[PDB]
Amino acid sequence: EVETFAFQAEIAQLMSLIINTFYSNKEIFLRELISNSSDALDKIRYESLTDPSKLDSGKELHINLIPNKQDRTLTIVDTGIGMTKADLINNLGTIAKSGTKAFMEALQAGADISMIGQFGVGFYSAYLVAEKVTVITKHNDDEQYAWESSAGGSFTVRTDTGEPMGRGTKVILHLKEDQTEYLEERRIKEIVKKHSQFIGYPITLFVEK
Ligand SMILES: NC(=O)CCCSc1nc(N)nc(-c2c(Cl)cc3c4c(cccc24)COC3)n1
């Protein structure tokens, strides 16, 4: 069963701005997804202090970067808190706690797209480089779910079976044809060193077979 939803109007507008604005400094998408993964790891770390059983789904707190040249995908995986089905729809489909409104106003008043992470919507910078984004997530309180969107104002949610994660979130970027530099080991290393060198969890860059 696949459920299809419309993004809240302002999120669709935000996504269109990211896709259509001429803006060359696209590499910042990676810092933004790593920062979200770091935040999700801080959350599970904190919850586990009072309830150690929340780590029964995995004690390791880390971030993995997985390029795949054959599939033309870059995946950012974390063992963070993850999202229930309700969290997934709310967080990715609506303004929720984000600064979506402030960001679009800021862009009209001198801000630039690299400042997206100051507004709680850094995830959407994935659309600078990806034609489609799939988000696989597993929270201790729910089953595993797959969210997906190629923009256009809609997204889908379905249960995800056959490749269960212990806990966390996997953001799969189906790269645009002209954005394959983000699959190169040297490029990813350069971006991590430039923008994510102080993250408080191990970031492992996988090698291709
Ligand atoms: N940090 C927390 O309090 C837990 C948030 C849920 S777990 C999580 N993990 C990662 N890697 N990413 C997200 C995540 C995604 Cl995928 C996408 C969006 C998010 C937004 C805010 C916070 C987290 C996210 C708003 O913009 C959309 N959420």
Angle between helices 185-195 and 28-50 (to 10 degrees): 60
**For ligand 1, is residue 188 a contact (CB within 6 Å)?**
no
Residue 170 annotated as lining a ligand binding site: no
CA 103 to chain centre: 18
70: three-class secondary structure by DSSP: coil
**What residue type is 144 in one-letter code?**
Q
* Distance in angstroms (rounded) separating the CA atoms of residues 115 and 122: 9
* Distance in angstroms (rounded) separating the CA atoms of residues 44 and 34: 15
**Quick check: 149 and 12 in contact, CB under 8 A?**
no
**For ligand 1, is residue 160 a contact (CB within 6 Å)?**
no
Select from 18, 17, 31, 29 the least CA-distant residue to 126: 29
**For ligand 1, is residue 134 a contact (CB within 6 Å)?**
no
Listed resolution, Å: 1.3
Burial class (CB in 10 A: 0-12, 13-18, 19+), 163: exposed
Select from 98, 97, 78, 84 the least CA-distant residue to 37: 78
Geometric angle at alpha carbon 121, from 5 and 103, rounded to 5°: 110
In the chain, how long is the greatest CA-to-CA distance?
A: 47
**What residue type is 190 in one-letter code?**
E
The residue written with tokens 């994510």 in the block is: 196
Domain boundaries defined on the chain: 1-209
For residue 92, give the ligand 1 atom closest to its CA.
27
Angle between helices 100-108 and 9-20 (to 10 degrees): 40
**Quick check: 7 and 154 in contact, CB under 8 A?**
yes
- Classify 1-209 by CATH class: alpha beta
**For ligand 1, is residue 92 a contact (CB within 6 Å)?**
yes
* Distance in angstroms (rounded) separating the CA atoms of residues 87 and 40: 13
Q: Which residues pair with 68 in a beta bridge?
A: 73
